[PDB]
Design brief:
It is classed as splicing. The structure is cut from a larger assembly and holds 10 protein chains of 10 kinds. With about 280 residues, chain B is an alpha/beta fold. Chain B has 12 helices and 8 strands. Chain H starts with 5 loop residues before the first helix and ends in a 24-residue tail after the last strand. Classes of the chains: A mainly beta (about 80), B alpha/beta (about 280), C mainly beta (about 70), D mainly beta (about 80), E mainly beta (about 70), F alpha+beta (about 100), G alpha+beta (about 50), H alpha+beta (about 200), I mainly beta (about 90), J mainly beta (about 80). Strand 4 of chain D pairs antiparallel with strand 7 of chain I. The complex binds zinc ion. Chain H binds one RNA strand of 164 nucleotides through helix 2, strand 1, strand 2 and strand 3.
RNA sequence: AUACUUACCUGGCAGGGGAGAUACCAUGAUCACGAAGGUGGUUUUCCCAGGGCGAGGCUUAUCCAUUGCACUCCGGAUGUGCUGACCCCUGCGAUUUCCCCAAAUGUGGGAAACUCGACUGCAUAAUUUGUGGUAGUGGGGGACUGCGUUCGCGCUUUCCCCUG
């Protein structure tokens, strides 16, 4: 497994922002990530394309449909890096 | 195999992981068996066995009333086919408190069936020789030279021992097998006269077992000497004891003192046989 | 009919005139000659139909499999 | 495999067109098996933008539409392995 | 080729964002390592406010962007 | 695979008989070839080599496309490598 | 693809989702992690020493 | 990082959520395609073939000069052998005498073995009319082989059955019948024939 | 892979498929070209319909970013590693 | 768990009339009876027709193989 | 921590430059002096891949020297980043046994044993990244429509230009 995916798994349990291909943005607690970058998240503030926001309880996102994630800065101090 | 779809046999650690990942469900389980529940407890499996129970559907458990052991009602429930209450069976050799905890949770008004040949040490003639390790090979040879009734079994602790001891005997002009079915046939047939083996099937009664290396616990020792047979000729188990075996002396001493078919002050009076180990 | 599946369906169609429709709206008509395990298609006497009606006559054509939406007889 | 060929083009100066209209002119330092491509002495010209000169550029290979090769590049020689 | 972790959402009512700006909602009866889904008692959620019921249905994993649990897992 | 053993010049059979024969024969006989490409331009040229993906090395290509009234455009490119994914359709020169 | 735990300095010769989760919810592992970030707080003492 | 003391786990805190900004590109299904993908029918300018190049250009490099060279050596070789072949006639060789059918062929001899030791070893099977050991007409070094003509065919047959592999002066010898003058179509090893397989590959 | 390693821990400007630029300290990559960028800033060019007027560049700070390889186009070196000598 | 491959098989057996939503194409759908299919989710459809949102008019196709990449959803009647 | 034992979870396979050429050596080639070649060396030419050595040069600042008359660059020192000829090496970073060279416990040469750095190939171009629904069908400046209008614009039809 690649270093960057490890880093994704290390942010399991914390707050991540995640932009999807569609342009929505999901901010919340990352519960569990898989190696494909499928992500389950809780307590999200979705931000739709237009700017309007919403609250969602439990969400799961296909890895193939993610642009990028914003992880907690502390992760930069994980051992490899 | 899981993908294919009546009975699952499992170990606790493996089963909980599978349930936890939903590789398998207990939706139509109507039969629960805990085999050697005391050994499960000894291994530290109580919490895992608890957690496994938590995945069984609660609504198929029998009611906790006198009806759970009413034969007319419970028989009618058995015959009720698909919709009967679950039934649970626990097998165990002992009932320490943890096992009784399992029973209180898993079972409802269970019947107990207690049965009771099972204790080879009482009925197998046992002899010991205290020596240093370097003395073992010559004492074995001296014993073999006295002659024996083939086949016999010689036990050793490590598989390399097995192979090298076996070579030496074939060197001394002995017919020796190492340790599948092929080996036992020859022995049974008379071809091979000596089986060398480690604590690792099914084999005829033997006149003699030699513990070239003493077992590391008394349960393995008991199983070994049990190879002289369940009954009939007592047979003989000869054990070479060294100072490296001191942690089994106390239990070995007990095994022999409880054997009316056995005569050993060398062990019985030994400083290391006086108190339980650890 | 049995369960008639894609590979043997096309193997049926090979030799016969067929029409293939691409994801991008054009369609190609002609004698299906060959196909592979990725379902690339070779056509012969191929003609191009843009937006439903005939555009022109082409020739021997390879169609890269990713481009194809559906394929159908005559 | 025909990337095998592209991997031989080190030190050759090429022009690459990207699936997004960007044109890259540069000298190939290396190509890898996924067609990812590294260049040096680069003039990148994003679609309808003024050129920009760069010491170095790497391109994820899926983005390449084509390589335009030197007029003189000895193809037959290079295609024998 | 590891399967996706959708045990959590099994037999739950979901709302799914799909490829073409299409949204659909229903009860998750199963899945594949491609993340192909089986939804049950599924409702179309057409762009017009209108909803339509087509029950049992297969969704290709490829075309699923995000799913939200309505019954909170 | 269908051929899980690593003796699979079954590709070489598939190139000779299968649909990529269009290329194998074009390369063989030095025939022109017209490719409709996913930048929506059309490349007419010769095929010096190709692979499974339809990666092609081309020579003497004329790239032709169409801008805005609609104006035709063209450019000569003497040696290129085209990435296979960007092929829609290849057409061998009829005559 | 064969998995290396940077915290434990050990390998999982055959990685799976199940295996890596088992490892990561392991006694040895969790201790090594705790240690790693305690050791990082020691890095902060190396600030005041300046 | 997951189940740590809340002491340390407060380090893994998010930064503030990022300002909204609208998307850059439209969604792919809702983009307006001003010149959508289009076909190639308009484009059969091609070129009329009476100005088309002929096919064959391509082929070997150093790979062609190499292949040609092996090919020629082989052919050159076959012609050499053909030519020798028609010089070869053991019925007209002054060395080959007497009854071929009473003649034994012995090879793999030690170069040190004398004609005496050999006559001794093979006399056991019967009286020998003649021994001819073979020497290089160039060096005069022994070739390791001889013809032994017996008085009687029977005795030759006997040596043939019993002497093969016989050890003489440390070396197992090979024993056969003379074939040069008996076997239809025989050629020796130097002419591309021969028996034995020490150097098949 | 040294072609990528050698720029590791530099400040690198990455062009994404939608035309965003990520500039960030280049901490890690993989066979996909998934990236890890530190102190990553996103920039983007906004066209003026209002007048034939200068472009807006719009910065937005992201911090520690994991970029999915699929969305990467190109990357060039922006600057040297933030430096530990004075 | 009902699993998506089986549910397609169910559709096959029933000879249920299936409507397919398409991938990145929102104006057209396709409907027909699933005669057969494969590992890639390519479908053989027996009486297929192509259905457009604006027209409410249906183009008849006959027997078709529809490549998997296109499918976004499978529906009944 | 180490070694083993049991249980549970897991489990692809294959490899180590390539292709030519070698007149010479070994293989002392079974037919009257001889195969050719093949195989193993040796030498060498291509395809070249990773290391060694760093001559020279590029860039910028501290200190030191310099008040100098040129028109052929061109004082010294020290340090961050670079580029890099000639000439070498052949594959790699760790372990175990045997044989020999021997300045003989050193320092070498020849074999294997199968061992990790997720090295590479592969039913890997078929839904989650490495063979496309991210195509690349403009922005602006003047002439030149109507409709709504809050007169700022939104939609819509053109012409001529600038420009990516
Ligand atoms: Zn660990």
């Amino acid at each position: 497994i690649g270093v960057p995916i490890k880093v994704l798994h290390e942010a399991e349990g914390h707050i991540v922002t995640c932009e999807t291909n569609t342009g929505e943005v999901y901010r919340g607690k990352l519960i569990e990530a898989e190696d494909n970058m499928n992500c389950q998240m809780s307590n999200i503030t979705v931000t739709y394309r237009d700017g309007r926001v919403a609250q969602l309880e439990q969400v799961y996102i296909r890895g193939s449909k993610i642009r990028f994630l914003i992880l907690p800065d502390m992760l930069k101090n994980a051992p490899m890096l | 195999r899981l993908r294919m779809g009546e009975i699952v046999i499992a170990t606790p650690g493996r089963l909980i992981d599978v349930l936890e990942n939903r590789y398998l469900v207990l939706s139509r389980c109507t039969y629960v068996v805990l085999d050697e529940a005391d050994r499960m407890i000894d291994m530290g499996f109580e919490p895992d066995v608890q957690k496994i129970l938590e995945h069984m559907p609660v609504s198929n458990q029998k009611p906790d009333t006198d009806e759970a052991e009413d034969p007319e009602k419970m028989l009618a429930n058995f015959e009720s086919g698909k919709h009967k209450y679950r039934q649970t069976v626990m097998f165990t050799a002992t009932m320490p408190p943890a096992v009784e905890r399992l029973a209180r949770s898993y079972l409802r008004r269970p019947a107990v069936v207690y049965i009771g040949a099972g204790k080879p040490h009482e009925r197998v003639e046992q002899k010991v020789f205290l020596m240093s390790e370097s003395e073992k090979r010559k004492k074995l040879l001296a014993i073999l030279e006295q002659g024996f009734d083939p086949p016999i079994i010689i036990f050793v602790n490590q598989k390399k021992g097995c192979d090298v001891l076996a070579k030496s005997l074939e060197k001394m002009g002995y017919n020796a097998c190492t340790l599948r079915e092929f080996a036992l046939s020859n022995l049974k047939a008379g071809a091979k006269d000596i089986l060398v083996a480690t604590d690792v099937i099914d084999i005829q009664d033997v006149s003699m077992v030699v513990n070239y290396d003493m077992a590391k616990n008394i349960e393995d020792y008991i199983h070994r000497i049990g190879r002289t047979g369940r009954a009939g000729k007592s047979g003989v188990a000869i054990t070479f004891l060294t100072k490296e075996d001191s942690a089994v002396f106390y239990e070995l001493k007990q095994a022999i003192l409880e054997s009316p078919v056995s005569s050993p002050p060398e062990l019985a009076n030994h400083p290391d046989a006086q108190h339980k180990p650890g | 009919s049995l369960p008639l599946n894609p590979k043997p369906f096309l193997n049926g169609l090979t030799g016969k005139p067929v029409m293939v429709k691409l994801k991008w709206g054009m369609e190609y008509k002609g004698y299906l000659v060959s196909v592979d395990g990725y379902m690339n298609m070779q056509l012969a006497n191929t003609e191009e139909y843009i937006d439903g009606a005939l555009s022109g006559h082409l020739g021997e054509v390879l169609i890269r499999c990713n481009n194809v939406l559906y394929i159908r007889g005559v | 495999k025909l990337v095998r060929f592209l991997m031989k083009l080190s030190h050759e100066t090429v022009t690459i067109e990207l699936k997004n209209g960007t044109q890259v002119h540069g000298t190939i330092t290396g190509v890898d098996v996924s067609m990812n491509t590294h260049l040096k002495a680069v003039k990148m010209t994003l679609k309808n933008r003024e050129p920009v000169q760069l010491e170095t550029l790497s391109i994820r290979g899926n983005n390449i539409r084509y390589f335009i090769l030197p007029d003189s590049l000895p193809l037959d020689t290079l295609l024998v392995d | 080729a590891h399967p996706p972790e959708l045990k959590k959402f099994m037999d739950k009512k979901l709302s799914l964002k799909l490829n073409g700006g299409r949204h659909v909602q229903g009860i998750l009866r199963g899945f594949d390592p491609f993340m192909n889904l089986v939804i049950d008692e599924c409702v179309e959620m057409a762009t017009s406010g209108q909803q339509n019921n087509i029950g049992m249905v297969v969704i290709r994993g490829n075309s699923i962007i995000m799913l939200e649990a309505l019954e909170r897992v | 695979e269908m051929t899980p053993e690593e003796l699979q010049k079954r590709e070489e059979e598939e190139f000779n008989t299968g649909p990529l024969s269009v290329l194998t024969q074009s390369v063989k006989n030095n025939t022109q070839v017209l490719i409709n490409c996913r930048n929506n331009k059309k490349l007419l040229g010769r095929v010096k080599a190709f692979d499974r993906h339809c990666n092609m090395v081309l020579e003497n290509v004329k790239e032709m496309w169409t801008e805005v009234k609609p104006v035709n455009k063209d450019r000569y490119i003497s040696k290129m490598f085209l990435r296979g994914d960007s092929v829609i359709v290849v057409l061998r020169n009829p005559l | 693809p064969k998995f290396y735990c940077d915290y434990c300095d050990t390998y999982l010769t055959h990685d799976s989702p199940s295996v890596r989760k088992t490892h990561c919810s392991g006694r040895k592992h969790k201790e090594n992690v705790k240690d790693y970030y305690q050791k990082w707080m020691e890095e902060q003492a190396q600030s005041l020493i300046d | 990082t997951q189940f740590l003391p809340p002491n340390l786990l407060a380090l893994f805190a998010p930064r503030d959520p990022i300002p909204y900004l609208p998307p850059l590109e439209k969604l792919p299904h809702e983009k307006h395609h001003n010149q959508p993908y289009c076909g190639i029918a308009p484009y059969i300018r091609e070129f009329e073939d009476p100005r088309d190049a002929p096919p064959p250009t391509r082929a070997e490099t150093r790979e062609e000069r190499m292949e040609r060279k092996r090919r020629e050596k082989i052919e050159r070789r076959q012609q050499e052998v053909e030519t020798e072949l028609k010089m070869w006639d053991p019925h007209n060789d002054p060395n080959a005498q007497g009854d071929a059918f009473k003649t034994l062929f012995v090879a793999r001899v030690n170069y040190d073995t004398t004609e005496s030791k050999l006559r001794r070893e093979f006399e056991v099977y019967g009286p020998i009319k003649r021994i001819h050991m073979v020497y290089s007409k160039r060096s005069g070094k022994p070739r390791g082989y001889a013809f032994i003509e017996y008085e009687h065919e029977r005795d030759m047959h006997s040596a043939y059955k019993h002497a093969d592999g016989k050890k003489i002066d440390g070396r197992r010898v090979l024993v056969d019948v003379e074939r040069g003058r008996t076997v239809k179509g025989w050629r020796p090893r130097r002419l591309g024939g021969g028996l034995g397989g020490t150097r098949r590959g | 892979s040294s072609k990528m390693l050698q720029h590791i821990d530099y400040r690198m400007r990455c062009i994404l498929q939608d035309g965003r630029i990520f500039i960030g300290t280049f901490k890690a990559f993989d066979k996909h070209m998934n990236l890890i960028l530190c102190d990553c800033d996103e920039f983007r060019k906004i066209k003026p319909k209002n007048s034939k007027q200068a472009e807006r560049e719009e910065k937005r700070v992201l911090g520690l970013v994991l970029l999915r390889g699929e969305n990467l186009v190109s990357m060039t070196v922006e600057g040297p590693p933030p430096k530990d000598t004075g | 768990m009902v699993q998506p491959i089986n549910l397609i098989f169910r559709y096959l057996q029933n000879r249920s009339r299936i409507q397919v939503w398409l991938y990145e194409q929102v104006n057209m759908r396709i409907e027909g009876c699933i005669i057969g299919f494969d590992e890639y989710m390519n479908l053989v459809l027996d009486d297929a027709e192509e259905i457009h949102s604006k027209t409410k008019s249906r183009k008849q196709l006959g027997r078709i193989m529809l490549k998997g990449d296109n499918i976004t959803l499978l529906q009944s009647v």
